[PDB]
């Protein structure tokens, strides 16, 4: 099976086992509010900042360069959104990572330091393919349920991508064309499972008030 198909199959499997949470479900159906949305995006700034440091190192090494499109970068975008949500820049020195986010960030930093291309591609897949599918849709829900201004929703729009549907097809084809040893491939698939698990834990912690 192509890598894109195998990764879809690691996702699916990881969903069962996942610690169940209702944070995102509640958020998207209008049961929470702007505060809880802001808490999510503060955690996201931490992990997208870590992720993108890792992406930068792996790209600079010359691994998977075409997949690692800098137009995907979200961290600075999130910071601009948070400046709007919080009213100031202060939040940068005051946000505290949940225990799940600490563990996630620690993995992403280890990947950066090791310049681990296969592991980075796994995390890139888990974060960005989900973002490229869940966008305009989540943003609209935040506008509709909670009146969040578009100025605070820039995370959901990729300025550099004209045609999202085609972009996702190209992305999956780039995955299918990545040259990997059997060992790198096995490592990448394992890491994709781990990344999905980190992600579920972030939401479980948000759902506990952590």
* Chain contacts with Na ion (rule: CB under 5 A): 18, 20, 24-25
CB of residue 115 to Na ion, shortest distance in Å: 32
Q: Output 10 or 73, the one with its CB closest to Na ion.
A: 10
Q: Output 31 or 80, the one with its CB closest to Na ion.
A: 31
CA-wise closest residue to 29 among 108, 166, 122, 138:
138
Q: Output 16 or 159, the one with its CB closest to Na ion.
A: 16
CB of residue 204 to Na ion, shortest distance in Å: 8
Long-range contacts of 130-138 (CB under 8 A, 24+ apart): 131/72, 131/74, 131/156, 131/158, 132/158, 132/161, 132/164, 132/167, 132/168, 132/171, 133/168, 135/164, 138/28
Q: Output 24 or 141, the one with its CB closest to Na ion.
A: 24
92 marked as part of a ligand binding site? no
8 marked as part of a ligand binding site? yes
In the residue annotation, 131 being an active-site residue is answered as yes
Please name the residues in contact with 179: beta carbons below 8 A apart, sequence gap of 6 or more: none
187 marked as part of a ligand binding site? no
Q: How far is CA 182 from CA 66, 118, 158, 178, 185, in A?
A: 21, 11, 33, 12, 5
167 marked as part of a ligand binding site? no
- C-alpha span between 107 and 29 (Å, rounded): 31
In the residue annotation, 135 being an active-site residue is answered as yes
Residue numbers belonging to the annotated binding site for L-ascorbate: 19
Residue numbers belonging to the annotated binding site for heme b: 8, 15, 125, 172
Residue numbers belonging to the annotated binding site: 8, 15, 19, 125, 172
Q: Which residues are catalytic?
A: 20, 48, 126-127, 130-131, 135
């Amino acid at each position: 099976a192509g890598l894109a198909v195998e990764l879809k199959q690691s996702t699916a499997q990881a969903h069962e086992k996942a610690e169940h949470s209702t944070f995102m479900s509640d958020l998207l159906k209008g049961r929470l509010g702007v505060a809880e949305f802001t808490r999510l995006q503060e955690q996201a700034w931490l992990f997208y900042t870590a992720l993108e440091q890792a992406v930068d190192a792996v790209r600079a090494s010359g691994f998977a360069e075409s997949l690692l499109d800098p137009a995907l970068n979200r961290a600075e975008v999130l910071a601009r959104d948070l400046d709007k949500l919080n009213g100031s820049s202060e939040w940068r020195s005051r946000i505290t990572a949940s225990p799940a986010v600490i563990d996630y960030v620690n993995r992403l930093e280890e990947i950066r330091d090791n310049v681990d291309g296969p592991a980075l591609v796994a995390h890139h897949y888990v974060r960005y393919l989900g973002d490229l599918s869940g966008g305009q849709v989540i943003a609209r829900m935040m506008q509709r349920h909670y009146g969040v201004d578009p100025e605070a929703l820039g995370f959901y729009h990729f300025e550099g991508i004209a045609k999202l549907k085609v972009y996702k097809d190209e992305y999956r084809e780039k995955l299918n064309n990545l040259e990997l040893s059997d060992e790198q491939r096995e490592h990448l698939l394992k890491e994709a499972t781990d990344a999905f698990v980190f992600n579920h834990q972030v939401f479980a912690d948000l759902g506990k008030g952590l």
